[PDB]
Amino acid sequence: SRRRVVITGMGMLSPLGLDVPSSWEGILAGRSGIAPIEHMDLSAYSTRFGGSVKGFNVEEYLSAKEARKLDLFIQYGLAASFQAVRDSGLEVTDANRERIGVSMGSGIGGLTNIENNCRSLFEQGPRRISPFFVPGSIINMVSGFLSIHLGLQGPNYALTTAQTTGTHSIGMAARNIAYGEADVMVAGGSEMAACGLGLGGFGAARALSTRNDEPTRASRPWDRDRDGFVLSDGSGALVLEELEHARARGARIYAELVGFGMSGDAFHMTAPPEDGAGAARCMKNALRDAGLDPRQVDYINAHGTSTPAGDIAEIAAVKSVFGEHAHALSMSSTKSMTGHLLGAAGAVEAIFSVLALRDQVAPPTINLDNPDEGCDLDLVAHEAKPRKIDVALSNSFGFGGTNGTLVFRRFA
Amino acid sequence: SRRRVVITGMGMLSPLGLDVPSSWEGILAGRSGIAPIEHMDLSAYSTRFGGSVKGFNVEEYLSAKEARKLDLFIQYGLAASFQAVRDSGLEVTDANRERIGVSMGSGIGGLTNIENNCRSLFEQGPRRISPFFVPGSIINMVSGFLSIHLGLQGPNYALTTAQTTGTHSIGMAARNIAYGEADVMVAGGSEMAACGLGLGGFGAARALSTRNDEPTRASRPWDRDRDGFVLSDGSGALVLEELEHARARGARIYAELVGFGMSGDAFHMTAPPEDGAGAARCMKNALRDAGLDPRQVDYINAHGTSTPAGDIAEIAAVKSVFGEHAHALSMSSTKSMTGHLLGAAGAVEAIFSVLALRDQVAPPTINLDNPDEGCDLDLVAHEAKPRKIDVALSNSFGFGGTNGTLVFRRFA
Numbered sequence: 001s002r003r004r005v006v007i008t009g010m011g012m013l014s015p016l017g018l019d020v021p022s023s024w025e026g027i028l029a030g031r032s033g034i035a036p037i038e039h040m041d042l043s044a045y046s047t048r049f050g051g052s053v054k055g056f057n058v059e060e061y062l063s064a065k066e067a068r069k070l071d072l073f074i075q076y077g078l079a080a081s082f083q084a085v086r087d088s089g090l091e092v093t094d095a096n097r098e099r100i101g102v103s104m105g106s107g108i109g110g111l112t113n114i115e116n117n118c119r120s121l122f123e124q125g126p127r128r129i130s131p132f133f134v135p136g137s138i139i140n141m142v143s144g145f146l147s148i149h150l151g152l153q154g155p156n157y158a159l160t161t162a163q164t165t166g167t168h169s170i171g172m173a174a175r176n177i178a179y180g181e182a183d184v185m186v187a188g189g190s191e192m193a194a195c196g197l198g199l200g201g202f203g204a205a206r207a208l209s210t211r212n213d214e215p216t217r218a219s220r221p222w223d224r225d226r227d228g229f230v231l232s233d234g235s236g237a238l239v240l241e242e243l244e245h246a247r248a249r250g251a252r253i254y255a256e257l258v259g260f261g262m263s264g265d266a267f268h269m270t271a272p273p274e275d276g277a278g279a280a281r282c283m284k285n286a287l288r289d290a291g292l293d294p295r296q297v298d299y300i301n302a303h304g305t306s307t308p309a310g311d312i313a314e315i316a317a318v319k320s321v322f323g324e325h326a327h328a329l330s331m332s333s334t335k336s337m338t339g340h341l342l343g344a345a346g347a348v349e350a351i352f353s354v355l356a357l358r359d360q361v362a363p364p365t366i367n368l369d370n371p372d373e374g375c376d377l378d379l380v381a382h383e384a385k386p387r388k389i390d391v392a393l394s395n396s397f398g399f400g401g402t403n404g405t406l407v408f409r410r411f412a
Numbered sequence: 413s414r415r416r417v418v419i420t421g422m423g424m425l426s427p428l429g430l431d432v433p434s435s436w437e438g439i440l441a442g443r444s445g446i447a448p449i450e451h452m453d454l455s456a457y458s459t460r461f462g463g464s465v466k467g468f469n470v471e472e473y474l475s476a477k478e479a480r481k482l483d484l485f486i487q488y489g490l491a492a493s494f495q496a497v498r499d500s501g502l503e504v505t506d507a508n509r510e511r512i513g514v515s516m517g518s519g520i521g522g523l524t525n526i527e528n529n530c531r532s533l534f535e536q537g538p539r540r541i542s543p544f545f546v547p548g549s550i551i552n553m554v555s556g557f558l559s560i561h562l563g564l565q566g567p568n569y570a571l572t573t574a575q576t577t578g579t580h581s582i583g584m585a586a587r588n589i590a591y592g593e594a595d596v597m598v599a600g601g602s603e604m605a606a607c608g609l610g611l612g613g614f615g616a617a618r619a620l621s622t623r624n625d626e627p628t629r630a631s632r633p634w635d636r637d638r639d640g641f642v643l644s645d646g647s648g649a650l651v652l653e654e655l656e657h658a659r660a661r662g663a664r665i666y667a668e669l670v671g672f673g674m675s676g677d678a679f680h681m682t683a684p685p686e687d688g689a690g691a692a693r694c695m696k697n698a699l700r701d702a703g704l705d706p707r708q709v710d711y712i713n714a715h716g717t718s719t720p721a722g723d724i725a726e727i728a729a730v731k732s733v734f735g736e737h738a739h740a741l742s743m744s745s746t747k748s749m750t751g752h753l754l755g756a757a758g759a760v761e762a763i764f765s766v767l768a769l770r771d772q773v774a775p776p777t778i779n780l781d782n783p784d785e786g787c788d789l790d791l792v793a794h795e796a797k798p799r800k801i802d803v804a805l806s807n808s809f810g811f812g813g814t815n816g817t818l819v820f821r822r823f824a
């Protein structure tokens with residue numbers, strides 16, 4: 001029968017910091033993590049900025065010898081996973097190793113590594129492709145490497161659902177624990193798509209903000225002058241744990257995961273429906289899964305990507321689900337500060353939702369100078385808002401019309 | 413408690429055929445799908461052969477214009493998915509579309525597309541990258557495109573667990589139905605990694621057979637002269653359906669999916685443990701899930717990749733799990749004929765496991781001329797073996813030590 005699931009550990013790399021507390025300080029201070037990209041020459045690209053992880057030292061986590069073999073998305077995923085496991089206090093033993101699994105996902109995975117090995121192949125020949133190309137690039141290897149390093153013998157898998165990946169990974173890992181397939185899961189996502197193919201590929205679709213001359217103001221969810229998403233790098237990991245398991249070991253519990261929804265739009269490969277029908281269906285599924293009155297929802301961490309169609313679809317979805325209560329909750333997009341971590345977005349935003357519950361504060365939507373037509377909810381413009389938050393909801397939507405909602409609440 | 417899950421539709425592209433009955437005819441005849449790779453210069457490569465899909469016509473499924481937007485692995489996954497839904501006779505309606513979902517995965521995803529866009533990027537610069545590069549290359553676009561085309565609003569996701577993808581995709585879709593999150597799922601996997609990057613990436617790790625002189629004899633699981641796996645392309649999809657739902661509409665039921673196991677080895681990034689400890693835990697997990705004694709298993713579709721370490725690990729795991737029953741079951745590798753479809757391997761082998769139940773016949777392991785030391789199980793050498801089969805297992809083991817087992821049972 002269905003068991004309860006709590007959050008006992010969190011870890012993060014973001015454009016605002018190399019761990020959770022540092023990232024969260026930047027979130028509450030309204031700081032932007034967005035800057036011109038330094039790691040490559042983007043003069044031929046229409047977008048030349050994004051949210052880089054600054055000053056990451058992989059030798060805080062792994063030997064230089066093994067790090068050299070791994071794409072940055074794997075390095076970031078392992079860093080966030082190690083932080084979350086350490087933060088949990090959990091001890092892996094022969095007695096519990098078969099009951100601890102991992103589900104760390106990615107939207108695109110090791111695009112930097114694949115681009116670099118493609119360069120080798122085309123300029124030199126296949127004899128210059130790294131022997132570590134496959135295990136160092138494919139998406140499941142965050143889960144794989146984490147399991148090898150910590151001895152986790154529970155369910156070992158990875159989701160790839162584009163910009164919904166982090167939310168789906170956390171939700172499905174919670175279901176694993178709920179249904180008794182595991183007692184503990186490390187779950188979240190990681191992304192590092194800032195290579196030529198990433199910036200060039202989103203750029204060819206004209207999906208990215210082109211505000212090169214003012215990167216910190218580029219990400220402006222629900223602002224009338226928004227012109228697309230800002231591409232960002234990093235990782236989020238959570239340690240999810242069965243309630244009675246967490247209670248038995250005296251774990252510090254941050255919050256309870258009470259609800260998870262998934263819905264397909266079945267609308268369009270890349271565009272969200274204007275009325276937010278898929279996001280509404282997904283949130284309704286998550287609220288019914290959590291056994292909630294929608295009026296219990298105090299805070300929504302929006303997907304809020306700073307796209308014309310995405311941002312207004314989300315307002316439509318929230319008004320349709322919450323009716324008059326839409327005017328009482330607070331909804332914000334931390335992508336205003338972090339940009340869009342793609343497969344990692346739902347993972348870092350799940351952590352931000354849990355911290356909104358811990359600290360009783362709604363993170364701001366920075367850059368919301370001129371709210372667009374119909375964008376008339378409390379979107380927490382400019383400044384963090386202290387308020388009562390018993391229930392927080394984190395939304396993600398992605399290519400393929402794939403939707404996820406997580407519902408968290410305070411645990412006493 | 414838990415609902416029962418049955419298989420009501422199947423679809424396939426493989427090196428043996430453009431559908432299930434053609435592929436299965438090849439399997440029972442001991443035919444090889446392996447041949448030198450055409451329309452591609454492999455001069456500088458140590459492997460020049462594999463399992464190609466021959467004569468695939470995407471315009472049976474999609475307009476030329478929609479097919480141009482999508483990597484071959486997505487085309488393949490859609491073809492298998494459309495076949496499986498057709499084969500099921502399911503009528504999608506406003507009354508059931510929120511109860512029908514998709515989980516089609518891939519191990520490596522859009523390497524061919526990435527390769528072609530890399531070529532453009534390096535030669536001409538980022539303005540030649542396709543606008544459809546991202547949505548046409550990401551692994552969740554089989555689930556995304558299928559849901560949009562058929563109007564499916566149930567759970568929409570994609571697994572990526574390397575060579576375990578197809579097995580995990582089917583098992584987790586079965587859990588969705590068992591626990592009431594969907595009534596129908598389309599599940600399986602697709603792969604097309606016969607590009608410079610795939611053949612070069614696996615070749616760089618010396619993982620591939622280099623028997624260029626005799627491609628049809630290269631894949632020789634448990635044979636003392638095996639020298640690595642054969643890379644193959646294609647797709648498998650199954651329609652999974654809640655039993656009462658299948659019975660109410662008068663569905664043709666092929667078999668019941670009674671068990672699913674997952675385990676991590678936590679051993680090595682690419683190598684299995686020699687004693688097959690992870691595969692043994694995974695099979696025991698799947699049998700416990702099914703409420704079956706190891707003695708009830710009649711047929712195992714092995715991972716059986718033709719690698720020195722992997723093939724011997726699987727013998728060890730089977731001897732360990734099945735004890736005095738280990739010789740009574742038949743265990744065969746259909747990869748002897750199909751080669752290794754990586755993320756689709758588990759999907760097409762689940763289909764072969766189901767057809768073994770329908771037709772009461774164990775597929776052969778072809779090329780098993782000289783069983784290796786300790787390879788003394790009933791490996792169905794050379795020729796198909798008619799036999800009693802009530803319970804069939806399908807095993808997948810992949811990079812990151814990720815394991816999957818599906819247990820299928822005759823249904824009447």
Ligand SMILES: CN1CC[C@H](Oc2cccc(F)c2)C1=O
Pocket residue numbers: 201202205206207270271272307309543544546547
């Ligand atoms: C309404 N719009 C705006 C952008 C999006 O189109 C795309 C298309 C391809 C890749 C991508 F990243 C985005 C859409 O459907």
Ligand SMILES: CN1CC[C@H](Oc2cccc(F)c2)C1=O
Pocket residue numbers: 131132134135613614617618619682683684719721722
């Ligand atoms: C048991 N053996 C044989 C090859 C494999 O090693 C690799 C390593 C990297 C990529 C790959 F494709 C394979 C292994 O560890």
